[PDB]
Design an enzyme around this catalytic site. Sequence first.
Site, short mmCIF file in Angstrom:
data_model
loop_
_atom_site.label_atom_id
_atom_site.label_comp_id
_atom_site.label_asym_id
_atom_site.label_seq_id
_atom_site.Cartn_x
_atom_site.Cartn_y
_atom_site.Cartn_z
N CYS A 84 0.88 -1.18 0.00
CA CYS A 84 0.00 0.00 0.00
C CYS A 84 0.92 1.23 0.00
O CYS A 84 1.96 1.21 0.69
CB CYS A 84 -0.93 -0.04 1.22
N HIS A 123 4.85 5.35 2.82
CA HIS A 123 4.91 6.60 3.62
C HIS A 123 5.81 6.41 4.83
O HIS A 123 6.36 7.38 5.30
CB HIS A 123 3.52 7.08 4.08
N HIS A 171 0.20 -3.77 6.42
CA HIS A 171 -1.10 -3.66 7.12
C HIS A 171 -2.24 -4.20 6.25
O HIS A 171 -3.37 -4.29 6.74
CB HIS A 171 -1.36 -2.19 7.53
N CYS A 193 -7.21 -3.28 3.31
CA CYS A 193 -7.00 -1.80 3.25
C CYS A 193 -7.53 -1.20 1.96
O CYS A 193 -8.58 -0.54 2.01
CB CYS A 193 -5.52 -1.45 3.45
N1 LIG Z 1 -7.69 6.93 4.74
C1 LIG Z 1 -7.26 5.67 4.66
O1 LIG Z 1 -7.71 4.87 5.48
C2 LIG Z 1 -6.27 5.24 3.75
C3 LIG Z 1 -5.40 6.08 3.15
N2 LIG Z 1 -4.53 5.76 2.12
C4 LIG Z 1 -3.76 6.78 1.48
O2 LIG Z 1 -4.40 6.96 0.25
C5 LIG Z 1 -3.45 7.45 -0.75
C6 LIG Z 1 -3.36 6.66 -2.05
O3 LIG Z 1 -2.88 5.37 -1.81
P1 LIG Z 1 -2.62 4.35 -3.01
O4 LIG Z 1 -3.81 4.38 -3.95
O5 LIG Z 1 -2.15 3.06 -2.43
O6 LIG Z 1 -1.40 5.18 -3.68
P2 LIG Z 1 -0.81 5.25 -5.15
O7 LIG Z 1 0.48 5.98 -4.95
O8 LIG Z 1 -1.02 3.95 -5.89
O9 LIG Z 1 -1.79 6.25 -5.96
C7 LIG Z 1 -1.63 7.66 -5.91
C8 LIG Z 1 -1.86 8.28 -7.26
O10 LIG Z 1 -1.76 9.73 -7.11
C9 LIG Z 1 -1.24 10.20 -8.33
N3 LIG Z 1 -0.66 11.52 -8.07
C10 LIG Z 1 0.44 11.88 -7.39
N4 LIG Z 1 0.60 13.17 -7.37
C11 LIG Z 1 -0.49 13.72 -7.98
C12 LIG Z 1 -0.88 15.02 -8.26
N5 LIG Z 1 -0.16 16.07 -7.87
N6 LIG Z 1 -2.01 15.19 -8.89
C13 LIG Z 1 -2.77 14.18 -9.30
N7 LIG Z 1 -2.38 12.83 -9.08
C14 LIG Z 1 -1.31 12.66 -8.42
C15 LIG Z 1 -0.19 9.14 -8.72
O11 LIG Z 1 0.28 9.23 -10.10
C16 LIG Z 1 -0.82 7.84 -8.31
O12 LIG Z 1 -1.44 7.18 -9.37
C17 LIG Z 1 -2.10 7.52 0.01
O13 LIG Z 1 -1.78 8.76 0.59
C18 LIG Z 1 -2.32 6.52 1.12
O14 LIG Z 1 -1.46 6.71 2.22
C19 LIG Z 1 -4.49 4.37 1.72
C20 LIG Z 1 -5.41 3.52 2.21
C21 LIG Z 1 -6.14 3.75 3.37
O1 LIG Z 2 -3.29 2.92 4.33
C1 LIG Z 2 -3.80 2.91 5.69
C2 LIG Z 2 -3.89 4.29 6.36
F1 LIG Z 2 -5.13 4.54 6.85
F2 LIG Z 2 -3.63 5.18 5.40
C3 LIG Z 2 -2.89 4.34 7.54
F3 LIG Z 2 -1.77 3.74 7.12
F4 LIG Z 2 -3.39 3.72 8.61
C4 LIG Z 2 -2.55 5.77 7.93
F5 LIG Z 2 -3.71 6.51 7.93
F6 LIG Z 2 -1.78 5.96 6.87
F7 LIG Z 2 -1.77 5.89 9.07
ZN LIG Z 3 -3.21 1.06 3.33
#
Ligand SMILES: NC(=O)C1=CN([C@@H]2O[C@H](COP(=O)(O)OP(=O)(O)OC[C@H]3O[C@@H](n4cnc5c(N)ncnc54)[C@H](O)[C@@H]3O)[C@@H](O)[C@H]2O)C=CC1
Ligand SMILES: OCC(F)(F)C(F)(F)C(F)(F)F
Ligand SMILES: [Zn+2]
Lengths: 374, 374
Positions: free
Chosen positions: B46, B51, B67, B174
Amino acid sequence: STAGKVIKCKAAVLWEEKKPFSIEEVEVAPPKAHEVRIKMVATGICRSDDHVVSGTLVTPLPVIAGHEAAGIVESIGEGVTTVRPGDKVIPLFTPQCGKCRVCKHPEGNFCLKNDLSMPRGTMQDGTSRFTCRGKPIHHFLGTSTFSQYTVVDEISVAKIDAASPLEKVCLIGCGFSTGYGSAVKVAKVTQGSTCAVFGLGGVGLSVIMGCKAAGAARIIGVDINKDKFAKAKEVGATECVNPQDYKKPIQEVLTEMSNGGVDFSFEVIGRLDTMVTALSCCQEAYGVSVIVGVPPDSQNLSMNPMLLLSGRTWKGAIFGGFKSKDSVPKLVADFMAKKFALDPLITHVLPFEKINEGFDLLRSGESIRTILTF
Amino acid sequence: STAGKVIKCKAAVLWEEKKPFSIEEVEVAPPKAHEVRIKMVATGICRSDDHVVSGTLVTPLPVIAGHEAAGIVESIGEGVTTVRPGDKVIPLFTPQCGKCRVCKHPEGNFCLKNDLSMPRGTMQDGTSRFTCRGKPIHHFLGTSTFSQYTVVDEISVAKIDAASPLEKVCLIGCGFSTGYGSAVKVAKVTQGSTCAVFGLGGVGLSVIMGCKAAGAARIIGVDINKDKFAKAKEVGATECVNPQDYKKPIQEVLTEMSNGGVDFSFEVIGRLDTMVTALSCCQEAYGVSVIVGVPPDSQNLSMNPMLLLSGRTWKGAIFGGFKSKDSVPKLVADFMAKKFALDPLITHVLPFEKINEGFDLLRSGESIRTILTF
Ligand SMILES: NC(=O)C1=CN([C@@H]2O[C@H](COP(=O)(O)OP(=O)(O)OC[C@H]3O[C@@H](n4cnc5c(N)ncnc54)[C@H](O)[C@@H]3O)[C@@H](O)[C@H]2O)C=CC1
Ligand SMILES: OCC(F)(F)C(F)(F)C(F)(F)F
Ligand SMILES: [Zn+2]
Ligand SMILES: NC(=O)C1=CN([C@@H]2O[C@H](COP(=O)(O)OP(=O)(O)OC[C@H]3O[C@@H](n4cnc5c(N)ncnc54)[C@H](O)[C@@H]3O)[C@@H](O)[C@H]2O)C=CC1
Ligand SMILES: OCC(F)(F)C(F)(F)C(F)(F)F
Ligand SMILES: [Zn+2]
Ligand SMILES: [Zn+2]
Ligand SMILES: [Zn+2]
């Protein structure tokens, strides 16, 4: 007798920021197609009118301010169908055109015909109905209620009950409806919840009324002026806290008092700092925080988005989220049936000519609402 | 047979920020009361795990990260009632204790036992089950899935369907559940709505899946990597835009494309600027914007609260707002019943010991999810 004629009457003109209103003679044109000329009966002094004086709320000067009012239709332009001469009316500072994508949305009330986003200070047709000293004078929010007579667009007026008491129901034109709706419609406060209300002026007391109506168990009033607490308790606050009495920041105090944060918080002041504090004090996973206060023009707040990621909801609203022309006549009908109270908001009544004393009463902290009578 | 004994196995240890993971021999203690030791079968890479490497997400080092996973219970500690040895499980990085104010609230999922808000990198009892050459190794979000074996608190594991394919359903731990739930549960996307999704990684594709399931008429994907657009369109994006193609800000582009703002916007990247852009591009009166992306530690965004006063709603969530232990089994059951697809998220499958190649694929932009198999 005045129908079709220019009216010469008294209005409170604001020529410059940070100056007293000038009570002087203005010329009020007759209404054009789909416009309504209103004889003002009563108008409240809302802090937003003071924001025009202070330059917190930017609108074109010179201006006839005032937006919380009630009066009687003097005359109608060609094509008006929703009001008649002699009808009692409340001007609507948030219009309801009924045609735009927002008016047709079940949850929107910020009609695209509003003069709030990009203020022009005109009628819908981009002109003014007011002359003073031979100069055109701007309108305010399509209302301009600090005048013996005003002209509004039809979409900015609602017909109310022929028997309503205008010296009270003028508050349905802004402060009551805004606070009440902020709780019952925007927040959707739940039975048994804990609420925190920041600012106990007329709009904050209205928020408390709405929180009590929704069956909240606890309603915590927050104000730096402890002279506000007694009235807040009369209209349903269960506790009041003054931030100046604590060593800890008030979001920490409120979080503890609520066993880990409130269900619903309201910012009813207009400060960037209290907007962030009010958000912080709602429970991190399921809390809701509603901005009602108007902040200083063009200024950004700074906040940590981890406050939202945990689960908080942050929202704001104009006029308590009410669709204005559908809602205002129902609110007056509910007031007539004693479903809510307006007298607790009214601390002072003055004639219109004493408008500057009215603004002094607000700025000193002494009043909630002053009602000006014409 | 390994029950009640120390397991020596391989884990990926992150000793220092901005270094490769190091495959190490670790010792995994047996589970204590109300703890579950799991033999890993599959774990997803993920962006949140990345991060930790980049220092975007601060958690004590050295650490076993990971995770998003599925495995089989190797043994249970004293008093475990919700899993048995041999059960298929998904570790829950957001726990569900079932006893805190949040677990009892109908909406809330951010259980107060979480290790996210103030990360300690331990078990619930404040100790580690992992040693590397006599050095304690921190846990991550009470999961630590980048290991052949891990130990979790019982409130951080759910039993799932005995027939489920662990090399696919690990994504329910996740990325799938977070994106899908952000659309269907947090935003409550409506039939015929317009949605904008910022970030087209595994979590943003899952947001698109949720918007299509909710019957959105338009789903606008936004990414600076145009190689992400094909797959976004496969899972339901009607349009994709690259902010780098435009001479003006993408919030203006999206407002013109949506004839005055979208119904629902999602930030699925983790940048402060895209969080403000995503709020801005939702319709000012009734738009909703959900933050999903994790931004850099201790950085504040700047925004004009007039964006909210008009009527917008801004919220964020962890894990798609799903109550983790209740929802993860139902999500697996729905997958088994073909209610949604996970194969579109899976671009690469590697054995565990090729973890660093998996992270290189993510960082290069090539992959969506790499699944590491044991
Ligand atoms: N709230 C939550 O519970 C969770 C949060 N996350 C977070 O969600 C986010 C995405 O995670 P993934 O999909 O695994 O990441 P990923 O890195 O696969 O996808 C992110 C996308 O953002 C694009 N990107 C980057 N900079 C950009 C910009 N300036 N403008 C437009 N697009 C841009 C990338 O090209 C990439 O395709 C991360 O920050 C991650 O930590 C992940 C899962 C759970
Ligand atoms: O990807 C999970 C997630 F919610 F984003 C986390 F890792 F738990 C966070 F929020 F990043 F700490
Ligand atoms: Zn995650
Ligand atoms: N969103 C909308 O549609 C509307 C917005 N407003 C705005 O709502 C706000 C309140 O309006 P009123 O009740 O008429 O104003 P008010 O000036 O009567 O009351 C504001 C209260 O805030 C208190 N206060 C000031 N600084 C404080 C602090 N740091 N901490 C806690 N309390 C503090 C004051 O003591 C006062 O009692 C204003 O900004 C006004 O412009 C008014 C009506 C409609
Ligand atoms: O008091 C009403 C109000 F919404 F604040 C206003 F006056 F319309 C505003 F927003 F200040 F313009
Ligand atoms: Zn007002
Ligand atoms: Zn409209
Ligand atoms: Zn809990």
